[PDB]
Amino acid sequence: LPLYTSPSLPNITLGLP
Amino acid sequence: GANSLSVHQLAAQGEMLYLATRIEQENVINHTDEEGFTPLMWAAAHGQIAVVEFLLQNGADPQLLGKGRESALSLACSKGYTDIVKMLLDCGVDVNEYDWNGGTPLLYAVHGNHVKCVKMLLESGADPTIETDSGYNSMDLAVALGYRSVQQVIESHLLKLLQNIK
Ligand SMILES: [Cl-]
Ligand code: NA
Ligand code: NA
Numbered sequence: 001l002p003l004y005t006s007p008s009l010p011n012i013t014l015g016l017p
Numbered sequence: 018g019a020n021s022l023s024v025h026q027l028a029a030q031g032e033m034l035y036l037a038t039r040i041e042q043e044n045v046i047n048h049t050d051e052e053g054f055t056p057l058m059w060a061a062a063h064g065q066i067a068v069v070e071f072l073l074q075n076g077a078d079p080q081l082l083g084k085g086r087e088s089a090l091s092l093a094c095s096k097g098y099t100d101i102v103k104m105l106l107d108c109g110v111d112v113n114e115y116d117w118n119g120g121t122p123l124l125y126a127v128h129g130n131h132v133k134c135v136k137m138l139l140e141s142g143a144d145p146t147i148e149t150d151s152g153y154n155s156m157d158l159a160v161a162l163g164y165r166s167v168q169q170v171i172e173s174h175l176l177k178l179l180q181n182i183k
Contacts, residue, residue, distance in 0.1 A: 002022060002023070002026045003026060003029050003030065003063070005029075005062075005063070006052060006054070007052070007054050007058050007059060007061075007062035007083070007087060007092050008062075008087075009085070009087055009091055009092065009095055009116060009118070009120060009125060010095060010125070010128060010129075011118075012118070012120055012124055012125065012128045012149055012158070013149060013150070013151050014149075014151060014153050014157070014158070014161050015151060
């Protein structure tokens with residue numbers, strides 16, 4: 001079956017969102 | 018068929034023979050999905066070395082970007098897929114490619130604590146002074162996250178590059 005893990009880049013920020 | 022895998026799935030799952038069949042049947046080697054991703058990006062994101070190699074040998078474009086300006090290189094760097102990063106660099110891609118977050122391949126390699134990728138990127142001209150949207154560069158990230166070996170690699174590179182400090 002298909003993989004549901006679509007390509008993604010993480011959140012790389014520092015400090016508060 | 019209705020439940021046949023897409024070209025992106027064939028690449029992500031390492032289904033070399035079926036992928037080879039599909040890209041011969043239709044011009045889909047660079048086909049973009051609903052997020053803008055190519056088969057190469059799916060293969061790179063899933064660490065499928067043989068498929069990345071096969072796609073590049075068959076002329077897949079490693080410079081394309083997804084809707085978030087994701088590149089095969091940044092996807093591989095974020096996951097620490099050193100051999101895939103090497104193949105993409107050997108192709109000729111932009112090592113400082115920005116995405117819509119201001120991320121670059123080096124920033125993702127630093128974030129993931131992937132020292133071999135960091136080394137390789139720097140050797141290929143990755144700029145550790147490029148900043149995220151929030152204004153932090155690769156050095157800043159390596160320090161903030163406590164990734165000391167990564168920090169050392171970056172700092173040693175900068176020391177050699179800078180001509181105002183010996
Ligand atoms: Cl790899
Ligand atoms: Na090339
Ligand atoms: Na120097």
